RNA sequence: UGAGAGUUUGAUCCUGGCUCAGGACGAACGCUGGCGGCGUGCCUAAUACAUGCAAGUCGAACGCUUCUUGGAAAGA
């Protein structure tokens, strides 16, 4: 849902495509841009926008970004279970990991996870890489995880019996 | 124990082919060079082969012959 802004962020022009329009005469290029935020704690988010020159479209963006964000249930550094994701095109994997290993993911989706401060994770991307569909995709399969508390609420019996 | 990128378009999304980044080898060739340790070396014509070796032994199974010390045994 809605939340607020009083921490620190984090941000990294993902891509850029200067993209045209044509009009009676040449044609006309704006600048569009894709940027994610998040202060790596287990809070995520992305934006966009366009301006004529790139510093305003990012300063664009950004601003966008930090009116989305989301949860990112953890714990030990690692996803709490299997997960997959999909938005128009983006099949998303994603699966836990052992300590220490490292993040095994590709470009665009490894900013995502980075920034939601995941340390141990693997990933593999299944069809589209478009920098956009592939973002999308990826936070609908974060927005998925379940809990051990939440479960444990849900369902009658409380945790530690749900082993 | 599962990472991707470039290329159709004025720009877009999707389907889609081609190419690249990783490893290994009885390897070959091009430039280049000190060694030690352990390995490996006709994949082609099961093509033709000069040369030297690559299978003999037993005298305690048996009769002979030549010697080196007219009969002597030993060794050869």
């Given at each position: 849902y809605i939340d607020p802004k009083h921490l620190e962020l984090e941000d990294r022009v993902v891509a850029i495509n200067r993209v045209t329009k044509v009009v009676k005469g040449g044609r006309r290029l704006r600048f569009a841009a894709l940027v994610v935020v998040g202060d790596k704690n287990g809070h995520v988010g992305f934006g966009t926008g366009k301006?004529?020159?790139?510093?305003?479209?990012?300063?664009?963006?950004?601003?966008?970004?930090?009116?989305?964000?989301?949860?990112?249930?953890?714990?030990?550094?690692?996803?709490?279970?299997?997960?997959?994701?999909?938005?128009?095109?983006?099949?998303?994997?994603?699966?836990?990991?052992?300590?220490?290993?490292?993040?095994?993911?590709?470009?665009?989706?490894?900013a995502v996870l980075e920034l939601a401060g995941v340390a141990d994770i693997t990933s593999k991307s299944l069809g589209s890489n478009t920098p956009i569909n592939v973002v999308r995709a990826t936070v609908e399969g974060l927005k998925q995880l379940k809990r051990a508390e939440e479960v444990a609420a849900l369902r009658g019996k409380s945790v530690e019996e749900i082993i």
């Open positions: 301006a004529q020159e790139v510093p305003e479209a990012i300063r664009k963006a950004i601003e966008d970004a930090k009116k989305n964000l989301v949860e990112v249930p953890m714990v030990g550094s690692t996803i709490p279970h299997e997960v997959i994701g999909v938005f128009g095109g983006g099949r998303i994997l994603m699966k836990p990991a052992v300590e220490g290993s490292g993040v095994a993911a590709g470009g665009p989706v490894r």
